Ligand binder design. Structure first.
Ligand SMILES: Nc1ncnc2c1ncn2[C@@H]1O[C@H](COP(=O)(O)OP(=O)(O)OP(=O)(O)O)[C@@H](O)[C@H]1O
Ligand SMILES: Nc1ncnc2c1ncn2[C@@H]1O[C@H](COP(=O)(O)OP(=O)(O)OP(=O)(O)O)[C@@H](O)[C@H]1O
Ligand SMILES: Nc1ncnc2c1ncn2[C@@H]1O[C@H](COP(=O)(O)OP(=O)(O)OP(=O)(O)O)[C@@H](O)[C@H]1O
Lengths: 101, 99, 112
């Protein structure tokens, strides 16, 4: 029942995407910079990777909020994918599953 | 789902060899980040992630392994993981059309 | 079956985590820097004077392990990253279909 959402997006949409997440009810995420090749050398372009672990009930809304705030209309807007998570543990407590988010 | 993530941890200098090897397998885009590798303090490495259809995962893994090999220790690893869903942000296209 | 373990932890715990891992027979890891956001922004400094920023630096640790070792490893990481204060982080497990060693073409547990 847990899922990982990975978003590759333009760095200047990060603020939009972040509020789009908090409206959806995602209460935190992890961000890193990436170098993206698509349609380092000149062909590489900076992007940000946003990863949020969520419940699977809430994944379509989250994916679409991300899509919604990351949309420019120009090439290189990126992608959002989802992949399974077996378990998640909060380090501080030992809470597992939804209680770990 | 017939979608897979490829993750390659490879030596930074092998990247271009890997980028060109990937066009030749018909894989266009890829996502790249710097990592610190502890294996044999740390060594700088690149992490290459590319989402692909499972009909080609085998060949794309091989073509990464061929471009990245030097025969010296610390060549890295390529692994495969399931991708339930992918969407193109600009168009909303899904699965193979999102690639 | 192989698994990927993902740990988001305080950067300063890396040495303890690394040590805890080698004690569980795990001899390699992948580490990267991330900007984390959650219940925790953090404080920063410019010419002596502090200011607030929204994200907090964390360390992302990735280890591919076998099914059998996976519980001992997650626990080992948790115990080493746990400080008692907030913002300790999270460790999650995910599936790995196949892993191959670049040099040898070794697959599976042989690839680790
Ligand atoms: N197969 C792939 N797997 C993972 N990431 C990819 C892949 N292809 C592209 N990317 C990432 O997506 C970013 C944008 O890629 P691309 O320029 O192809 O844009 P897109 O949004 O997917 O399509 P378009 O630009 O046509 O809207 C790239 O810079 C790279 O970071
Ligand atoms: N269990 C693991 N999970 C994820 N990444 C790993 C793991 N072990 C090692 N690595 C990553 O792989 C890189 C290379 O690993 P290491 O030097 O141990 O051997 P190798 O290159 O895989 O194989 P060999 O050294 O036998 O050629 C490391 O720098 C680290 O980033
Ligand atoms: N839903 C999520 N998906 C991915 N990463 C997250 C998510 N929530 C938090 N994180 C990451 O974990 C870090 C810690 O998050 P948070 O501030 O909620 O504290 P915690 O250790 O999870 O809980 P506590 O502060 O109660 O011990 C964040 O900085 C971020 O890197």
């Amino acid at each position: 029942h847990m899922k990982l959402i990975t978003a590759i997006v333009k760095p200047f949409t990060l603020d939009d995407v972040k509020t789009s997440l908090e409206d959806a009810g995602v209460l935190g995420m992890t961000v890193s910079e990436i170098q993206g090749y698509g349609r380092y050398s000149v062909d590489f372009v900076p992007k940000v990777r946003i990863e949020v672990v969520v419940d699977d009930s809430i994944v379509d809304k989250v994916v679409d909020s991300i899509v919604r705030a990351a949309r420019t209309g120009k090439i290189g807007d990126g992608k959002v994918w989802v992949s399974p998570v077996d378990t998640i543990v909060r380090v501080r407590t030992g809470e597992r599953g939804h209680d770990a988010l």
